[PDB]
DNA sequence: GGGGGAAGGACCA
DNA sequence: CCTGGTCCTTCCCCC
């Protein structure tokens, strides 16, 4: 929940339930959460077993760990992210005046993937159904999303990012980390005229610090597309993309270079804001009396012996409020993907030619990138919501809408036979390459 | 006990 | 009446 707080959540949740009590849906949930919850006795069964000796040698262990990670703990570089406000919607809004003053959403009666600030005060979210969205707010408009006209606009604003972090990072059409470090030393001797701009005496100048560069970068993004951005100073990512947030929308924060201020911010900072953590996480660690950074730290007794190798990990280097410093390599492909939702299609004919039309889209975005990949999986949801999906891996490499077709179909029959003689009522189906080659 | 491969999930925009 | 990616953790089965 990020945007609009102070809400009236009993109404909202009283309506958002109204249209779910009884819905299909609704009940895979319901027991997909028996999952969640039988899943905390794993944990708990497993902690009754943990005993006072263990977790004191489970200590040193991490105390030490603690210990050079924060003799290791990096404070000159300056981190910012930048985090778009509403950004489809505001897109949207920008390019059709008609939308200006009013609630909408980017998306479809069954669901919106992003709404204006606007109708947030109603309680209309992303992920949240649109034909539940019309309920909070009769009057919300459903604009249909148009991503080449974001690429758009992502493409733009980057044009601006270049010019302080040239070697950014940019993790989605609507958000970069960037690294001012290098940029500000240049920048404590720019003249001022270097640093003037005109606000479309009419006229303004940016100052010298970090918190003035992040200022003169979301005005000059503002100028460009009439879109404003939040964005998070701090002196690593994660507690960056949390500073993106704190003041959102049009606005920014930030956490100084000390120990201190990064202490004096993590302490009360509910676990779930932090990027990773979610709504299971939550529960579990909730479970166990964790709800603030610090109760984090100081539960890691348990937790390292209670939790995986890397999830401890994680959960500890915030704890510590650590994240990472250095902006990494583009980066390569794992996989790429397409599926889709439709009405209930329990005649297997269609079920074929659905995967057919499904490979061929799959190819051509594959060609695009002149890429072949040689592991290919199904994804098929039952009209339960239950959720199956099929792997497969070739020897030689695939490519094309027939050749991985030939793959599909056979992935497929299985489950149709698996399941004969009753057919699969079906929502979804979806296909995915992944596998890569390198360099050799 | 590794590692490559399939089945499932968590969490992210 | 609920919409392309990555990166894990469990089994598996090869060695
Ligand atoms: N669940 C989703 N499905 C499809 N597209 C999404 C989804 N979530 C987010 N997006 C797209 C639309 C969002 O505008 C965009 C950026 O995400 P995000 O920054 O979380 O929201 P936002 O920029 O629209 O609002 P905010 O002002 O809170 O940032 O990514
Ligand atoms: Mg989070």
């Known amino acids: ?104 959403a980017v998306g479809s009666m069954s669901m919106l993937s992003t709404s204006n600030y606007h109708a947030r005060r109603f309680g209309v979210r992303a992920a949240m159904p649109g034909f539940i969205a019309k309920r909070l707010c009769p009057q919300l408009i459903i604009v249909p999303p148009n991503f080449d006209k974001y690429r758009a606009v992502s493409k733009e604003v980057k044009e601006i990012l270049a010019d302080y972090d040239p070697n950014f990072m940019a993790m989605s059409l609507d958000e970069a980390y960037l690294n001012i470090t290098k940029h500000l030393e240049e920048r404590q001797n720019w003249p001022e005229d270097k640093r003037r701009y005109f606000i479309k005496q009419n006229s303004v100048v940016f100052g010298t610090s970090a918190q003035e560069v992040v200022k003169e970068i979301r005005f000059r993004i503002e100028q460009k597309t009439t879109l404003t951005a939040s964005a998070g100073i701090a002196p690593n990512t994660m507690l960056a993309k949390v500073c993106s947030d704190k003041n959102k929308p049009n606005g920014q924060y930030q956490i100084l270079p000390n120990r201190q201020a990064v202490m004096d911010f993590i302490k009360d900072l509910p676990i779930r804001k932090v990027s990773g953590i979610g709504k299971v996480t939550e529960k579990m660690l909730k479970a166990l009396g964790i709800i603030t950074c610090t109760e984090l730290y100081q539960q890691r007794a348990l937790l390292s012996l209670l939790f995986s190798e890397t999830s401890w990990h994680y959960f500890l280097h915030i704890s510590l409020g650590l994240g990472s410093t250095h902006l990494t390599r583009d980066g390569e492909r794992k996989s790429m993907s397409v599926e889709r939702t439709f009405s209930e299609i329990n005649k297997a004919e269609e079920q074929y030619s659905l995967c057919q039309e499904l490979c061929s889209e799959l190819a051509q975005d594959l060609q695009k990138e002149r890429l072949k990949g040689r592991t290919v999986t199904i994804k098929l949801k039952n009209v339960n919501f239950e959720v199956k999906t099929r792997a497969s891996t070739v020897s030689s490499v695939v490519s094309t809408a027939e050749e991985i077709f030939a793959i599909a179909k056979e992935l497929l029959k299985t489950e149709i036979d698996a399941d004969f003689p009753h057919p699969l009522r079906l929502r979804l189906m979806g296909v995915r390459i992944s596998s890569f080659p390198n360099e050799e």
């Open 1 to 104: 929940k990020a945007g609009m707080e102070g809400l009236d959540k009993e109404k909202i949740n009283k309506i958002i339930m109204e249209a779910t009590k009884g819905s299909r849906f609704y009940g895979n949930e319901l027991k997909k959460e028996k999952q969640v919850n039988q899943r905390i006795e794993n944990m708990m069964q497993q902690k009754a077993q943990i005993t006072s000796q263990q977790l004191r040698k489970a200590q040193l262990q991490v105390d030490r760990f603690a210990m050079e990670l924060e003799q290791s703990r990096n404070l000159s570089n300056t981190i910012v992210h930048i985090d778009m406000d509403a950004f489809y919607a505001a897109v949207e809004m920008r390019d059709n005046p008609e939308l200006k003053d009013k609630p909408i």
